């Protein structure tokens, strides 16, 4: 009756990143005042990524929650698997999601600053936000042989 | 802790600088201005801004100089001594620091004043933490050292003029107000550096510490090209010495702090801004409005934190000293000299 | 079970220390204390034999209560946010002292946000939610109950903080006034359906409401 | 705002005075002190004193008739007060019915206007109404007079989250037996109604605006469930207020009868000034907690029609 | 048989945030008031609007106190605290809200008139966290005593 | 006997405000009559007969 | 039975509360005291009010004491503990909210004579928490039996 | 548990010494300090310190009389009622003097510079003792309450 | 048995991606010198994030081995050697991410005034990430010995 | 009696010796730092010391008695009693010479300009003992009524 | 007690990849910081990275072997002896990296200057690795004595 905490613990942390990401990634958009060109498409790219990743935790907890059931073999011990499972994925969420979050707040900036420097930022969010994406296939390879 | 940045009384704080930091004018506004010969095109465009509400109500018909010393007084008067009744937490004892940090050096420049026959009820523009008829005419007509130290510890909080008090009344530096001012300056950089490096952390305090260093290898430059000449004792506490986290180690600060003019620690320090080691007067201190004016918008693009209310003061400072220098040769109908040479306000 | 009450005191006394944080404190324990309990509670797990683990039982269904409180310091958190950047504008300018209020009204919806899920979550007057580790087996439910109410409440007082924080950055609208607030204002309202999505899917995960049998 | 062609809304007149009477027969202490500006109307039109007694003063008609509501509202809710579960589940149907279809007159005038304003009207009403209109009618269907059935079930959100989650909708206690294709018609057409919505979109502008365009196609669909989930505040202070107002009312009521003699009658009559004044610091408490429905109409109201502009049209409108 | 806790952490949390409520909006009314003293009136919204929160958990606390009785077990000990503590931590979040929010209502309140409706809009919606709490724990106090 | 037969009384039997006012703001009185005859259809109460729930206690 | 900590705990944080509600009063009164000698009189209120939170906890804790025997149960040792926690966490925030709307109300009037009904009155409001848990620990200890 | 009842007889005076060392420190301190401004006032700033030593004796007093009917052996009836007594009149003493601290140096420093001050400093701070008098009191009702020892 | 092992596979990517997190975090903040032309510094200045990035993928392929070797049923033998090689790479993971994010703080900021740095800056990060490939190679072998657990 | 007996004799020389260190080095670091202004206050300052080795004495010869009393077994009721006064005349010595330390740190430091407050530093040093003889006294009785270990 | 002895293993390369990392961090800032003075010495401070990060090749070899030798029956004394070598190897590493760490930003900032003590910094850098291999060492004994299998 232990594995709930690992479906809940998911979504938990990843909606604690999320919204930690999309609040420092939101916070940015203040300076300087400029929107006439692009402004505001340039600066929606992280926090779509932010925001797209309590997706995996959302559909994980959802998988992990249908997963449980008294009909099958779950005692002794099959909840032990889901709580790690479930801190990965929200540990990496959280931490993809706080250095997301610091992330953006930068390349919101430098849209505004140069308009061809989103290469490297687009970059840099690639590489933070695939930490997120690997712990919700580690989540998702673990929850597809869990009982 | 880096990723969240967040406090109680410090949102008070950042709320009521974010309502002035709307106001707060730009480079193309001074570029605009000084483009402008006409007083009335010039008092017309500059009307139009957070500094331009007190001038709204008193206007300007000659440009003389006491409009903008009452301007820059009603303006800092209630822009900074409107938040600090309002304010609570270690928030106010952090900007209490941060204006008394200019307080120390504006109270040795009215005790100095006092001694030289100056008047005893006058103040400059400048920002300090009371009025000017509060606490500034008692430590600026008193010329004794008992009453300085009551003065300044019958005000909440205490100030670091109280400490340095002591070395100047023991005679330890100097008698003269350049050895007690080297000091005095000093002294306001390495309290700022001793409450970020105690409230340090909070915030993630990445283009404050740059500033910060970049602040005091400035005022180093300026102490070692002002002691050039001006017989400097190395010995004697007349000497800059802060440590930095930049591209300069506090051994190079110290050697820069004196009288030598070493452009081998300006070279290393930095290779592309305006300080690179040249010995012009009026370079380095033009270069110093503009890389000081700098790193505040990085500072100025977050919420809820101390670096853009730390970065509002010294940008409301420049801005303050841009209109002040800038409404004087526009006054007068001459071109201007810093205004017209610096390219970031 | 005997966990009952250390689980009410140690709830008492970390919500006592956790509110006296934020505020003026007055009384508040040790550095000490933390390490020296962490020491004779990792000493115990290495002798001998036997090994500890948690034990299954759900001893309280006050989660959802917990969860509302969670979700109202969520809205509070960011209310406070909201004011005062309004109150930090005042009156600089003729502006609108209730055009900010688009983040206080999602701030508001935060504490609705697991407060129907409170009432959502009573199961026909559930003083036991079914046959659980009491006088019986099969406990996994009301176990289960409190991680789901924990869950929605952490993910509404997460979502009120991040439009709370979109709303008073949204309250200025730019460092510069040259422009449109809009587009902080787009951002904000962006992250207005994780509260609602979050209380949906905490809502699906935490099941119907089963009767007590 | 002041506009020509005024006023600047029918339904807030309505909406706004009957709203802020669900909040709170304690509402007759109210009727009677808001009875008092109907003649002093002339004599303190002109008084120029206190920042809280000038705008209160400005809404003479809408407090006169928000506090003659307030009298039937109050003295219609104060069903049971006993229990804590039956009371709960008409305030909750009540206030499911009364913000639905304050929220479909609402956006009846927006959508038949046609004045971010062009589309998303004509296509939209459909989900919000296949789902409120499945809710309102199972309740209104579950209202009847009966019955062999269930309790507690469902009473409003709770089948609302039933909803959605499978085709052959059989979830209870509230529910129509007659019949539960409404469920799956509602589902295919909330299902097709997401293409349809935001693909007029584009093709009426040709003959960036494009996350204007789809903040302003999902802002009707979180609009909707805002307006929904927002809509629980009427029965929440209601139902607060009056559990509020009778368990400290309930202490005083019990000791001043008890006593008797000549000392009794003294010791009641000092003891109903008690009474008394919690029962009027209750009616006040929850007039001074029912500001609320002033932004909720300034926000949801001025949202459909196109601030205090409006608000301050809303009182100008009845004086001229 | 733990029910008393959560009888006391309902006074406990909403005197406390009541407290700190009541000094922050009285620190703010104090310094406003000495501008002033026409304005105490007007400023004094924010002192009646937090000191309106600890009528939620008076009445909470009387109605753990009517709920409890000679009767002994472990679902009557677990509702009381969860209610007590849900009316207790959003009075004091809706406290600690309205005393910040009452001080720059009333500071920004002061100078400027048209703050007024921005901090009374602002002050009056941490109401509506205990009230929510309040109808939890009214609702879950009503279905704590059923007989078992 | 229903709850919806008054609404189909006040929906039937009213006119729904066509027009029974004046030609100067008939839009306000027209509407206002018929949002006070809904709120006060809405204003039911019955609160018993299949969900009148309080039995113990 | 282990009512005593609880006993003692209502006296505890009173008198808690009420010294550190009394040092926050003292040193706005004494940095009020120093501007005229009438304003002592005016600005002593504060500390009359703050000093009246200890006899609440204190009454309820000579009055818990003199239900306390030979014969006991450990049901009649939880209700003593809850009521005396909340009628201390109610003292100590209701004192810790005294101390600065009293500091507050002295440093405002002392500077505008006319505001001493303002901060007597905004003083007074927030004695209410220690009366409302002194009432909650007066039913919870009424409520109590199988103790002596 | 025999004898358990000790700590509650050691931690009034433990809590009382401990608060009126700290009173008497913070009183001391403020003395101190005031006393280079104006050496005039130094005996009538001096009561203070003095003032708010004296509060020890109250658990001292308590602990003794405590100790005074104490054996060798005690039953679990005393070791609740003692330990709440004797922690409510160390909490009492040390509120008393953490509050008596501070009220003597603010009315020490507050008196120093006007004489007028010492009796609004003195009615002030003669009000800390009400604390630790009712929780001696409380104390001594709660020891007096007590039987079963041995 | 016990079934105690199944948080070795997310203790790994924990520290992992917290390393990898805080690394991409301090290294993506920092200004830069613009132009109209590009220096080709914004290819150079991008090599910390990339080469902390690294550390991410080695403790999800020794996380997806103890995943892999986790299986249904769970053994002590399996079970206590899964355990304890995640916190090996999870630390030099976490420790070379956080040097990598010290390092590409100072690498953007010294590389505005003079691009020469990241020959030094490079070896700096190639030396770094040597510390986080031990311990991906020492849980590689801890995971190796893991299978067959009876 | 089953176990930590012996802890109550060493906590009162531990505390005691504590305060009276840190008040001996905040005497004489004043008097060491006042010394070179006026050479008037150097032997007026051994009396802050002179005096506070008294405090740790006292501890001394009530550990010296309670460690006479403790052998190798403990009894039943001993235990609670000891630590209690233990830690009692520990912290009642410990609170002693921390207040007594910075009063005489400041009266040594105020007195150097103009001794006038040689008299209060003196009446507040002379009258700060009572803590440690109210501790004292009751160490001595809580260790008296623990006597007969066995 | 259980089979535990991974944690020892995990340990060593935790601790020297931390403090490793902890020392090539504050190499690689001093370098990159020191490089925009002069090209020439960015060769010559590349030493103490590459010289502290051999520091964790110790405890990754300790880990190694403590891993190649992990029984499946474990004992009271049987697994004590990995995590006393695991944990001295890597707090030896560690604060061999932690003083490598301020010996080499003393050095690379001594040198930045006027470059004269390279010499003397690699001489007195050099000296630091024998608190690790002396550790390593021990850890390697400790290690190596564990596999009884009594």
């Known amino acids: 009756f232990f594995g709930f905490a690992g479906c809940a613990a998911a979504m938990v942390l990843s909606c604690l990143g999320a919204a930690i990401g999309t609040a420092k990634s939101g916070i940015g958009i203040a300076g300087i005042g400029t929107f006439k060109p692009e402004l505001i498409m340039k600066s929606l790219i992280p926090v779509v990524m932010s925001g797209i990743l309590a997706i995996y935790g959302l559909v994980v907890a959802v998988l992990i929650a249908g997963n449980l059931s008294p009909t099958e073999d779950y005692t002794l011990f099959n909840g032990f698997m889901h709580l790690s499972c479930g801190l990965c994925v929200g540990f990496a969420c959280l931490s993809s999601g706080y250095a997301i979050g610091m992330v953006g707040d930068v390349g919101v900036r430098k849209y505004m600053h140069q308009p061809r420097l989103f290469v490297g930022i687009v970059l840099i969010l690639i590489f933070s936000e695939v930490l997120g994406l690997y712990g919700m296939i580690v989540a998702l390879i673990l929850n597809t042989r869990g009982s | 802790m880096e990723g969240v940045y967040f406090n109680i009384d410090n949102g008070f704080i950042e709320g009521v600088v974010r309502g002035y930091r709307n106001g707060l004018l730009s480079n193309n506004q001074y570029i605009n201005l000084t483009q402008c010969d006409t007083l009335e095109d010039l008092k017309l465009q500059l009307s139009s801004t957070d500094y331009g509400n007190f001038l709204s109500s008193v206007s300007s018909e000659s440009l003389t100089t006491s409009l903008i010393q009452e301007y820059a007084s009603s303006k800092l008067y209630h822009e900074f001594n409107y938040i600090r009744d309002q304010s609570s937490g270690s928030t106010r004892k952090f900007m209490d620091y941060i204006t008394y940090g200019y307080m120390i050096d504006n109270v040795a420049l009215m005790i100095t004043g006092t001694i030289h026959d100056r008047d005893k009820g006058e103040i400059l523009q400048r920002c300090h933490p009371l009025g000017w008829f509060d606490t500034l005419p008692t430590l600026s007509v008193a010329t004794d050292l008992e009453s300085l130290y009551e003065t300044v510890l019958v005000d909440t909080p205490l100030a670091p003029y109280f400490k340095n008090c002591f070395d100047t009344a023991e005679e330890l530096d100097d008698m003269n107000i350049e050895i007690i001012r080297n000091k005095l300056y000093k002294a306001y950089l390495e309290d700022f550096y001793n409450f970020v490096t105690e409230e340090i952390p909070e915030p993630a305090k990445e283009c404050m510490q740059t500033l910060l260093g970049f602040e005091a290898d400035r005022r180093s430059i300026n102490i070692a090209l002002n002691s050039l000449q001006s017989s400097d004792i190395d010995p004697d506490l007349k000497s800059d010495l802060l440590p930095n986290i930049g591209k300069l180690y506090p051994l190079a600060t110290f050697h820069l702090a004196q009288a030598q003019d070493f452009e081998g620690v300006r070279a290393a320090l930095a290779n592309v801004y305006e300080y690179r080691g040249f010995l012009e007067t009026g370079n380095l201190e033009d270069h110093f409005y503009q890389l000081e004016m700098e790193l505040c918008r990085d500072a100025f693009t977050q919420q809820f934190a101390i670096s853009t209310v730390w970065a509002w003061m010294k940008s409301k400072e420049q801005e303050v000293r841009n209109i002040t220098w800038i409404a004087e040769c526009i006054a007068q109908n001459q071109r201007e000299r810093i205004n017209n040479y610096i390219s970031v306000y | 079970m005997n966990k009952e009450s250390k689980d009410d005191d140690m709830s008492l006394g970390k919500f006592s220390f956790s509110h006296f944080l934020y505020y003026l404190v007055l009384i508040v324990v040790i550095v000490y204390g933390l390490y020296k309990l962490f020491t004779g509670h990792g000493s115990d797990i290495n002798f001998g034999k036997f090994l500890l683990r948690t034990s299954p039982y759900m001893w309280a269904n006050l989660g959802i209560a917990l969860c509302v409180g969670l979700s109202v310091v969520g809205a509070a958190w960011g209310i406070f946010i909201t004011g005062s950047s309004m109150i930090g504008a005042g009156v600089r300018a003729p502006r609108i002292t209730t055009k900010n209020l688009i983040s206080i009204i999602f701030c508001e919806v935060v504490a609705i946000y697991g407060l129907i899920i409170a009432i959502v979550f009573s199961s026909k007057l559930t003083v036991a939610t079914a046959e659980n580790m009491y006088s019986k087996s099969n406990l996994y439910t009301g176990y289960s109950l409190f991680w789901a109410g924990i869950t929605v409440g952490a993910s509404n007082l997460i979502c009120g903080i991040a439009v709370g924080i979109t709303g008073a950055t949204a309250a200025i609208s730019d460092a510069a006034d040259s422009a449109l607030f809009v587009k902080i204002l787009v951002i904000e309202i962006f992250g207005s359906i994780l509260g609602l999505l979050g209380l949906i899917v905490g809502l699906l995960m935490a099941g119907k409401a089963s009767e007590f049998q | 705002a002041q506009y020509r062609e005024i006023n600047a809304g029918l339904p807030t007149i309505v909406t706004f005075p009957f709203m802020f009477a669900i909040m709170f027969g304690h509402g007759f202490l109210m009727t009677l002190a808001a009875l008092s500006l109907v003649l002093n109307e002339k004599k303190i039109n002109k008084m120029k004193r206190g920042e809280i007694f000038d705008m209160a003063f400005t809404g003479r008609y809408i407090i006169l008739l928000m506090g003659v509501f307030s009298m039937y509202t109050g003295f219609l809710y104060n069903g049971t007060e006993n229990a804590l579960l039956f009371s709960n589940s008409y305030k909750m149907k009540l206030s499911i019915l009364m913000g639905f279809i304050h929220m479909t007159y609402s956006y009846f005038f927006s959508l038949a206007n046609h004045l971010d304003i062009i589309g998303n009207f004509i296509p939209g009403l459909l989900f919000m109404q296949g789902i409120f209109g499945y809710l309102s009618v199972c309740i209104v269907y579950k209202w009847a007079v009966d019955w062999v059935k269930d309790g507690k079930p469902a009473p409003g959100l709770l089948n609302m989250l039933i909803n959605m989650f499978l085709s052959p909708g059989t979830i209870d206690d509230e529910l129509y037996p007659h019949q539960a294709k409404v469920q799956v018609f509602l589902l295919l057409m909330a299902l097709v109604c997401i293409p349809w919505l935001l693909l007029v979109k584009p093709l009426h502008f040709k003959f960036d605006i494009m996350i204007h365009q789809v903040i302003h196609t999902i802002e009707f669909c979180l609009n909707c469930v805002s307006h929904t989930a927002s809509y629980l505040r009427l029965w929440a202070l209601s139902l607060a207020h009056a559990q509020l107002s009778s368990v400290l009312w309930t202490m005083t009521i019990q000791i001043a009868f008890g006593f008797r003699g000549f000392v009794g009658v003294f010791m009641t009559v000092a003891l109903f000034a008690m009474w008394f004044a919690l029962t009027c610091a209750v009616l006040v408490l929850m007039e001074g907690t029912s500001a609320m429905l002033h932004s909720l109409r300034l926000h949801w109201v001025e949202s459909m029609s196109k601030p205090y502009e409006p608000f301050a049209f809303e009182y100008k409108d009845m004086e001229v | ?148 | 006997y229903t709850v919806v037969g008054v609404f189909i009384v006040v929906s039937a039997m009213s006119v729904l405000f066509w027009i029974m006012a004046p030609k100067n703001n008939q839009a306000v009185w027209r509407s206002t009559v018929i949002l006070t005859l809904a709120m006060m259809f809405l204003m039911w109460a019955i609160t018993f007969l299949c969900q009148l729930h309080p039995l113990v206690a």
Request: proline letters at 2%.
């Open chain 5, 1 to 148: 048989f733990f029910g008393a806790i959560g009888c006391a952490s309902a006074i406990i949390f909403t005197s406390l945030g009541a407290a700190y409520g009541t000094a922050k909006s009285g620190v703010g009314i104090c310094a406003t008031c000495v501008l002033r003293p026409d304005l105490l009136f007007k400023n004094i919204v924010p002192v009646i609007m937090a000191g309106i929160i600890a009528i939620y958990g008076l009445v909470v606390s009387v109605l753990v106190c009517y709920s409890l009785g000679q009767k002994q077990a472990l679902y009557t000990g677990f509702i009381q605290l969860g209610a007590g503590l849900s009316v207790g931590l959003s009075g004091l979040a809706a406290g600690f809200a309205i005393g910040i929010v009452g001080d720059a209502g009333v500071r920004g309140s002061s100078q400027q008139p048209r703050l007024f409706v921005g901090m009374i809009l602002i002050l009056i919606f941490a109401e509506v966290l205990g009230l929510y709490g309040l109808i939890v724990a009214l609702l879950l106090n009503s279905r704590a005593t059923q007989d078992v």
